[PDB]
Amino acid sequence: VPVLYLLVCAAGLGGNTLVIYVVLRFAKMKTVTNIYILNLAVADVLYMLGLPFLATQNAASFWPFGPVLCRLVMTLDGVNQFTSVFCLTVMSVDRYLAVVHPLSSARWRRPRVAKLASAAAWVLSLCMSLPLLVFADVQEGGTCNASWPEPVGLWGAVFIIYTAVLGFFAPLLVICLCYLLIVVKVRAAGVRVGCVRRRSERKVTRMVLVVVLVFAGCWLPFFTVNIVNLAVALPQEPASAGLYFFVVILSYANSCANPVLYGFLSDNFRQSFQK
């Protein structure tokens, strides 16, 4: 299991690095889509970097005696976990600006504006990670678990509910299903007046539906369990630990499937993927 987790983390890091190299190191930049892809890829690979640190779960607390437990890892990991979804939402926003409103895009989209939005996402990344770093209680028992070293019944619950708000409320339920609006508009008007063959349906569905499905499916359990056990606390059995053993892997599933599916499976970047 640790070997499989390490292999998955390495594969995700390599894929994200390849995506960045094809986008950034290949001089394929100065496009808002390329900038957004680079930001999401960097966020995902940096987020991935914390997985090998937690890969060796042999004792209660990790070998680092504090400088790594709650100071750096459990802050940067959470910050990235938020900012990756914060880049996915602006990816859907940029899609909406392109396909739906191409009449004002470059007026509201510029490489300067793309960098501005990227920095805004990266700076709201630490807004929620500050409790994970400033209010971080270095726990001698366990790798690191802070919430509030004080009354967690309310403080930890408030943190978890606001984490759910910043991870699912807006970024999924609005932005990620804004993708369906593009396919709806295309199916309604783009093809009906123009032609008869529905060649612009299957391919776009096999993008939008698969992205929505993979993201929700590999991103929902992590927060559904953290909300269910908030009130109806899960009893401590080895079955619960085994379930949580792979849930973190499925949480990583989002960040390993994003570089290949969000910015590599499409032919537009697949053309430059070679060489």
Partner: peptide, 6 residues
């Protein structure tokens, strides 16, 4: 809760 067991 968090990234660990509760």
């Amino acid at each position: 809760x968090x990234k660990y067991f509760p």
